[PDB]
Amino acid sequence: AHKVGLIPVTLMVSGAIMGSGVFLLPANLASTGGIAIYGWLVTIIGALGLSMVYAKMSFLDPSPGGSYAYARRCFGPFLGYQTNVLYWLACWIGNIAMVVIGVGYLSYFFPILKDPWVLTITCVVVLWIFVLLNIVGPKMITRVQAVATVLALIPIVGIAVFGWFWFRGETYMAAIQSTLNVTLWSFIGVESASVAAGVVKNPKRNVPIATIGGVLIAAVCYVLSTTAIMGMIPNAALRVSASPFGDAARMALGDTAGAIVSFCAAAGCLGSLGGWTLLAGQTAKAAADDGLFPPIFARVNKAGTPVAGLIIVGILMTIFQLSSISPNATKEFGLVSSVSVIFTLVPYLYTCAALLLLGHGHFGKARPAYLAVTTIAFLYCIWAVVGSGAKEVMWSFVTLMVITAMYALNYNRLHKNPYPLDA
Amino acid sequence: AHKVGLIPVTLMVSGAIMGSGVFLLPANLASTGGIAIYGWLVTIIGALGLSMVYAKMSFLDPSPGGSYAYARRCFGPFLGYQTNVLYWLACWIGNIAMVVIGVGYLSYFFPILKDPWVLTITCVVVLWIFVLLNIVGPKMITRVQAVATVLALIPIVGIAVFGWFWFRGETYMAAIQSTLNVTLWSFIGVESASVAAGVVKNPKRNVPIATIGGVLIAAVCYVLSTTAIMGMIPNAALRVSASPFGDAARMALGDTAGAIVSFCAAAGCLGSLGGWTLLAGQTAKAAADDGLFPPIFARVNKAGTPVAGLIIVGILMTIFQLSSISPNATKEFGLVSSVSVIFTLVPYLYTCAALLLLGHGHFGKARPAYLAVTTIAFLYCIWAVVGSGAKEVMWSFVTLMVITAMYALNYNRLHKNPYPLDA
Numbered sequence A, B: 001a002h003k004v005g006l007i008p009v010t011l012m013v014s015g016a017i018m019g020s021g022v023f024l025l026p027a028n029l030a031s032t033g034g035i036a037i038y039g040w041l042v043t044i045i046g047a048l049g050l051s052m053v054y055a056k057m058s059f060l061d062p063s064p065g066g067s068y069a070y071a072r073r074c075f076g077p078f079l080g081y082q083t084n085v086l087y088w089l090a091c092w093i094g095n096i097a098m099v100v101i102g103v104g105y106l107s108y109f110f111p112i113l114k115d116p117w118v119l120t121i122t123c124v125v126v127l128w129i130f131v132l133l134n135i136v137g138p139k140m141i142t143r144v145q146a147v148a149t150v151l152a153l154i155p156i157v158g159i160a161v162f163g164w165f166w167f168r169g170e171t172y173m174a175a176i177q178s179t180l181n182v183t184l185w186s187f188i189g190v191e192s193a194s195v196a197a198g199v200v201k202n203p204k205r206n207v208p209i210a211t212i213g214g215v216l217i218a219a220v221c222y223v224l225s226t227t228a229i230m231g232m233i234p235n236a237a238l239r240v241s242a243s244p245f246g247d248a249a250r251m252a253l254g255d256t257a258g259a260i261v262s263f264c265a266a267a268g269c270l271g272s273l274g275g276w277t278l279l280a281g282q283t284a285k286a287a288a289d290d291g292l293f294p295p296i297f298a299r300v301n302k303a304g305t306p307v308a309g310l311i312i313v314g315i316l317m318t319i320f321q322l323s324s325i326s327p328n329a330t331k332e333f334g335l336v337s338s339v340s341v342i343f344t345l346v347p348y349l350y351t352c353a354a355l356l357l358l359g360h361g362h363f364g365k366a367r368p369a370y371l372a373v374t375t376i377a378f379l380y381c382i383w384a385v386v387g388s389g390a391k392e393v394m395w396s397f398v399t400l401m402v403i404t405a406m407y408a409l410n411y412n413r414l415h416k417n418p419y420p421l422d423a
């Protein structure tokens, strides 16, 4: 019936940011290399800045759930409304990618998991298992995310520690498109604790610490595993198709790296979606409470868990999953990953705008930065949009319009304009 | 020192919507035909609806300048800020296309106007001439726009009246991309009177009448000239390259149609940009007055004309014109026309949202529509975005972020949040 403690929360943030990314990014990145690494560097810096922004903002205002709340204070109910619809959509839509991936990893052990049918079925089942777990509660979901991420660090920490022996000279000059997709994706999760603040005991101290702790851990692992791989698989080796990560895996860990890796990968991927289901429920609840989403989303139980909220998300998730637009259908991760990333960027951007419009004054002698630090978060949000696909940036731009019109229609009486008419 | 009268205003709206479009659209449209006509039909219907929306909204609130004001009341200063930055940008950027076009038309008479140098030079000069005219005033700019559009109707009205004799059977089944560009472009201008309300005597009566009058006239001419051409140039004739409009022109008007047409075309194109320079100055002034743009834009003279405002716009226009991104450089109208159109759509969309959030109550027994009529305006805005280019929709999406961040940075103290902090 109560909230969650620092360590578990901070591991949740670390895990929001990893799960899929840790194993996808370093492989991918080493593989293509060169121009790609700069991109990676840029987005690392941007994520670190954005994290300071969130840290500071959740500090100022320990409200649930993250950017939704900040955008509502900062601008209107309308920007609140919109921020949540976007972020909410992003959380669960992204799950459609992660189930297919994290269950793919276990195909190593259960060959049958590669018949599309079994894959799809097994996928829906796992989605609902994590819905159930969330219904059990934040404590249950968080404990599982915790064990899951640490498990996923075994292989990352391992390759790092034993890649030092094989560490050498670095070919840094040497497709860039889709790596950019993966790299942008791999650093979403910065905002998680801030969004899940309503469900963390002592938000004001715990959340800012948690987000920086989490980002810091995640930043460290990404850089270490990445440099490690670039250093230990040769430049002429880069070529070897289907190689990349797995190569470093076996050479640094034995001929059981297969099992260990495709286990901790799966571990980090699933149970990370446990956390994203959670987060989806939290924005929606946060918003429904203010009357900026339908009220069923605000409907909680004893512990204050939006069970109907989470159940719905389970339903939507499985409709989408069984749809033709799903990775199970298309065998493609670009659409889902892309909208998932871009729908997060608007919340990011409003959060930055929020820090300044809300927390000027609370800056004092340390003002620029913040100013500096946050125009960096701004430039990263822009960077990410510009580096995303045009089709998908357009689909998000359309979604903005649909959301606008939909608020107009669904809230027309009872809105309360900032500068009303008369008569 | 004073304002403008119905007839002139309503001709301005008619001319905002034509100038370039009347001669570009019907040609183009007949040429490609088929699927293209449906697109045309859709956008006609959407523009008619959007016009009812603007008519009703300027009625409710006869404020300057249009959607900027409505968005400010409806949502925050921030949505006000953004609506204006977008619409303001659109007005003058679009001018870069129109000068090159409308001066092109006079190349018929002055062959030299086809050396790129002379073309460019002549272009900047004409831009400034219309800046001057605006500085003389709204009355001067409007009178010129008036004579200009009526002149441009001579050829349209003519082809219509004498295309009835040649009217026959219609091949309606038969690239679609760029026609869609032209058709979307050709119906921008609906919002003009509403934006130029601050400078029209008796806004509340005059403006709603003006916008419907203007749209109505424009709607009529587009449909008449278009059906006329489709009916009088044969299906096998459709092919004939460089033909299209000119064919119908000569066959319905003599072997001087060349002069008459490339004169009234030029007429409608230039002096339409007189009106767009005006409109640019009006949004900026409207906004600067509320402290949502720099104050120089609010700086008026005796008659209350933002001379520095308009001069600046002249400067920006000529920087852009002499830039590599200009039609003088690229020989292409897609970029400029596209951003010009998409930057208008967000103002449209917020205006629709505004009508409902502001004017519920003032609907009474006639409520749905409005509801109906305005979800149509909504669907048209979405339609236009979706039918635009992905690159350019993305550039507009980025611009949104730049505008957001820029408001954050430039207004952080003094903003006044809807739900502030403490301490």
Ligand SMILES: CCCCCCCCCO[C@@H]1O[C@H](CO)[C@@H](O)[C@H](O)[C@H]1O
Pocket (backbone or CB within 6 Å): A116, A117, A120, A121, A124, A125, A322, A328, A329
């Ligand atoms: C309620 C949980 C189970 C409901 C769904 C049962 C599995 C449906 C089959 O899956 C799909 O079958 C298509 C037909 O071959 C494949 O083309 C596709 O790859 C695969 O995605």
Ligand SMILES: CCCCCCCCCO[C@@H]1O[C@H](CO)[C@@H](O)[C@H](O)[C@H]1O
Pocket (backbone or CB within 6 Å): B116, B117, B120, B121, B124, B125, B322, B328, B329
């Ligand atoms: C202040 C008004 C006049 C200032 C600008 C003078 C004209 C500059 C030349 O124009 C440009 O010259 C380029 C070089 O050839 C061409 O490639 C291009 O097509 C054309 O756009």
Ligand SMILES: NC(=[NH2+])NCCC[C@H](N)C(=O)O
Pocket (backbone or CB within 6 Å): A016, A017, A018, A019, A020, A021, A022, A090, A091, A092, A093, A094, A095, A096, A098, A185, A186, A187, A188, A189, A272, A276, A340
């Ligand atoms: N459902 C989601 N929105 N997931 C986002 C995942 C992003 C994260 N950086 C990862 O690699 O896993």
Ligand SMILES: NC(=[NH2+])NCCC[C@H](N)C(=O)O
Pocket (backbone or CB within 6 Å): B016, B017, B018, B019, B020, B021, B022, B090, B091, B092, B093, B094, B095, B096, B098, B185, B186, B187, B188, B189, B272, B276, B340
């Ligand atoms: N500068 C501008 N924004 N011009 C818009 C022009 C659109 C109008 N429908 C036309 O055909 O001329």
